[PDB]
Amino acid sequence: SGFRKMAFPSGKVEGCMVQVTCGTTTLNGLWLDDVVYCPRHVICTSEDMLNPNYEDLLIRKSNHNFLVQAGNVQLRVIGHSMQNCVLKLKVDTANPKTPKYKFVRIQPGQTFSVLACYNGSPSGVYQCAMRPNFTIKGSFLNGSCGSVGFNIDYDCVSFCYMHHMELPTGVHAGTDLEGNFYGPFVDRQTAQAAGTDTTITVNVLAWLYAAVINGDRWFLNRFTTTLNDFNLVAMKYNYEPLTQDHVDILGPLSAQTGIAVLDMCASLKELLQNGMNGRTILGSALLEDEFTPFDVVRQCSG
Amino acid sequence: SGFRKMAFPSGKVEGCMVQVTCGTTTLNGLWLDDVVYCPRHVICPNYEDLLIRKSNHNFLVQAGNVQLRVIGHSMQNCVLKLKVDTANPKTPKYKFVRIQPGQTFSVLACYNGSPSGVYQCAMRPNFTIKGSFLNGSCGSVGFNIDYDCVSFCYMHHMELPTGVHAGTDLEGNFYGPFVDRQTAQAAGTDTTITVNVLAWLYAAVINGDRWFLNRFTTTLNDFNLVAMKYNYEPLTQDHVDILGPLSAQTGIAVLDMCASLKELLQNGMNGRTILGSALLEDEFTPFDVVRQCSGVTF
Ligand SMILES: O=C(C[C@@]1(C(=O)Nc2cncc3ccccc23)CCOc2ccc(Cl)cc21)N1CCC[C@@H]1Cn1ccnc1
Ligand SMILES: [Cl-]
Q: How far is B109 from chain A (nearest CA, A)?
């Protein structure tokens, strides 16, 4: 019993965190095999950030300009290339602590763990989701750039995020491990704003199923809804449209609890209408949207 | 910017998790040097009588895909200490510490000696933890990392009928009035960790949330009279002193922040949130707020 926002054990990722320094800039890098991956803005100063020509800044750099540090050991950079917004620093030593890994690009609504690092040193781990507006509501201070987002499925670490910037609303933008940004974001200190955020509906439904599994049924009603009428109501509360894929993905949770997805949808409709009325659901006074159907099946069952 | 429930990096603890099996019972063990620590209920009650019937080879210990041979066994309160032939090479710098209610720690939840998740939680004033544990999680540990040293503070033993959890420090002493026995046990009436709510209000001010602030101040006694009415833990002078650095950083005196809390308790949030929450968060200590809003690394 119990429902917590649970991050994956960070151990496999901790053994990959290194410090990357180029001139005065110092951020984090991910050392996997003989390659260190880090945000390409490590080559930039604060001046360069307005309109940086990365190919032009990188062509002026040699291998020895990049000081890489794994613990108390300096790694020798033997090569460097750029893949989108990530810099790939070829080093002379392969990381002995390299785990089984994959680079995965996630879709909005997907959750992952973030190992927040400063100066190549892991300082904390937390769980978060890719918001529908392609930002993450993270906890990052200056020097956290290069901190990574990951999921561990079995023994394999699936890297899905590298931190690059904080938007003016305090939310964060980053890339996948191939340098492609999530969202219309760019690694430039230009006028960029996070789009209007929406609630991840499939996740709220999944979290309501977790509450039913944990014995909380106060929010259930005798009503059902059509997918279209639910989306008409959901859109008015800035909820993401629930698609037929979301309904299919919720199938196992619906079967386990005996509450049809559209029946749970009607509870959500009523919850949006009435609020909680001094009540909580899984110790929360707000509808939680940062637990996927897979997270619920993982934590409530296995 | 950003405020999340943040756990310590679990890596140093992951390298200590082993599987302990005695008969049909299977749970987790903490392998530190040549000893494996685990709940004494793995033998299951008269624990001296059940343990005297066990030999070393009855305890199957598994570190990954390697079986460890138990060469000895002793009991320290509610914890079983299984002496193994091999010292854990991944043993970190560590201490066994007993924590006080209100203090927080990270829990590395494990099943069959395999870490599956990490979360932050606080020792509730009623000595239970609002954790997330399924069957097979017994032996999962609570810890804080101070610089390079892992301070083990909790070993999970059981779940109470309200879904909350009970366990011991790493010396086998239970937190709270619990016993490792299938009997009528209930968690006492819980209270809100006041110093933690105040610390979390300071974190909201650091993150640019000032809607709840007012021009008012209060005396410690008047705040305690109000707090005791809402099942809040009494705020002591030590709490006031501990919140000093946050009071200096934000320019809001502790009794000034207490007046904000008093108004939130009597009036509510009014459709507003603080750090994305509609409830007053009490599972962040003043140190957690300082550590997260400074960037302390391990
Ligand atoms: O500019 C940036 C980083 C930046 C950014 O967002 N940083 C931060 C990240 N995470 C959390 C943060 C919390 C508090 C303050 C800053 C944070 C600044 C704002 O403008 C942008 C715009 C775009 C991008 Cl991709 C990056 C940034 N850096 C980081 C190194 C190199 C370079 C120039 N540089 C040098 C020395 N300090 C900064
Ligand atoms: Cl995905």
A: 9
